[PDB]
Design a protein around this motif. Structure first.
Motif, PDB file in Angstrom:
ATOM      1  N   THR A  72      11.026 -22.134 -45.315  1.00 34.00           N
ATOM      2  CA  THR A  72      12.535 -22.691 -44.488  1.00 34.00           C
ATOM      3  C   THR A  72      13.541 -22.121 -44.414  1.00 34.00           C
ATOM      4  O   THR A  72      14.160 -22.307 -45.823  1.00 34.00           O
ATOM      5  CB  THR A  72      12.014 -23.998 -43.770  1.00 34.00           C
ATOM      6  OG1 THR A  72      10.561 -24.592 -43.316  1.00 34.00           O
ATOM      7  CG2 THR A  72      13.018 -24.630 -42.798  1.00 34.00           C
ATOM      8  N   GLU A  79      16.246 -22.370 -37.366  1.00 35.24           N
ATOM      9  CA  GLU A  79      15.394 -22.495 -39.334  1.00 35.24           C
ATOM     10  C   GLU A  79      14.479 -21.237 -38.024  1.00 35.24           C
ATOM     11  O   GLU A  79      14.045 -21.517 -37.253  1.00 35.24           O
ATOM     12  CB  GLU A  79      15.743 -23.555 -39.117  1.00 35.24           C
ATOM     13  CG  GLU A  79      15.009 -24.262 -38.942  1.00 35.24           C
ATOM     14  CD  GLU A  79      14.239 -26.078 -39.821  1.00 35.24           C
ATOM     15  OE1 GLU A  79      12.679 -26.013 -39.680  1.00 35.24           O
ATOM     16  OE2 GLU A  79      15.684 -26.766 -40.389  1.00 35.24           O
ATOM     17  N   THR A  81      10.303 -19.679 -40.535  1.00 38.79           N
ATOM     18  CA  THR A  81       9.838 -20.071 -41.528  1.00 38.79           C
ATOM     19  C   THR A  81       9.248 -18.069 -41.955  1.00 38.79           C
ATOM     20  O   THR A  81       8.999 -17.657 -41.212  1.00 38.79           O
ATOM     21  CB  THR A  81       8.068 -20.391 -41.121  1.00 38.79           C
ATOM     22  OG1 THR A  81       8.824 -21.577 -39.786  1.00 38.79           O
ATOM     23  CG2 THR A  81       7.438 -20.333 -41.984  1.00 38.79           C
ATOM     24  N   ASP A 101       9.183 -26.502 -46.937  1.00 39.37           N
ATOM     25  CA  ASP A 101       8.573 -28.170 -46.739  1.00 39.37           C
ATOM     26  C   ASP A 101       7.310 -28.282 -46.773  1.00 39.37           C
ATOM     27  O   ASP A 101       6.331 -28.518 -45.792  1.00 39.37           O
ATOM     28  CB  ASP A 101       9.017 -28.423 -45.242  1.00 39.37           C
ATOM     29  CG  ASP A 101      10.299 -27.951 -44.747  1.00 39.37           C
ATOM     30  OD1 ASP A 101      10.748 -28.933 -44.979  1.00 39.37           O
ATOM     31  OD2 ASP A 101      10.659 -27.080 -44.046  1.00 39.37           O
TER      32      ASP A 101
END
Ligand SMILES: [Cu+2]
Ligand SMILES: [Cu+2]
Lengths: 118, 114
Positions: A72, A79, A81, A101
């Motif tokens: 992340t 944010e 990915t 995460d």
């Protein structure tokens, strides 16, 4: 400087714990450090599950390549990915951070100009 | 901030008297980089980057496969998970003797262009 070429398994370098006010659950291997680098350094970062590099900025750029897992990326606004096979360019002074995460380790290469240390 | 899948960068085919069976992706190039550039090379089976040297260093990370590294004399094969530091002016080159594609990341100071 010196001549030659260094060829080494990155995992031969022990992953050292990084612990600062803004970083927890992170280890780092210096691959091409200050002792050798004419211009920029190469490090391999490991983000443990739940590990966090909090939002910050630096006066130099960073060049990242994700080697393993799903990372992340913390941005000034929100944010995003990324995963293995992604690259990231962080401009000088741009806010950035990282969080894992997932329940398995994330690894990424990060290179900075040597003025920023190793 | 730029965040991108490297595969999605269009590779450039190289086929010259010194480089054959190689594709190059410029991930972080001259337009973005203050100091150094990031490229991703794919070497096809039998592909070759012949021996040469440069006034700048190179920093490499092997991403996939078994990479044969040509040295001033002789050669050394390494694999995914190896890094390589090529000193300025050191003779070097690459070959893929395997039956599958080999990939490596390579960074150079921007004077080396992209
Ligand atoms: Cu940073
Ligand atoms: Cu070269």
């Amino acid at each position: 400087g010196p001549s030659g070429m260094i060829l080494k398994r990155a995992y031969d370098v022990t992953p050292q714990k990084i612990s600062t006010d803004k970083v927890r659950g992170v280890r780092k291997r210096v691959l091409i450090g200050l002792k050798d680098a004419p211009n920029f350094v190469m490090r391999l970062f490991t983000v443990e599950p739940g590990g966090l590099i909090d939002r910050h900025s630096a006066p130099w750029e960073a060049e990242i390549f994700v080697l393993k897992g799903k990372l992340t990326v913390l941005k000034e606004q929100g944010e995003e990915t990324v995963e293995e096979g992604f690259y990231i360019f962080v401009e000088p002074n741009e806010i950035h951070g990282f969080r894992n995460d997932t329940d398995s380790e994330v690894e990424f290469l990060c290179l900075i100009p040597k003025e920023g240390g190793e």
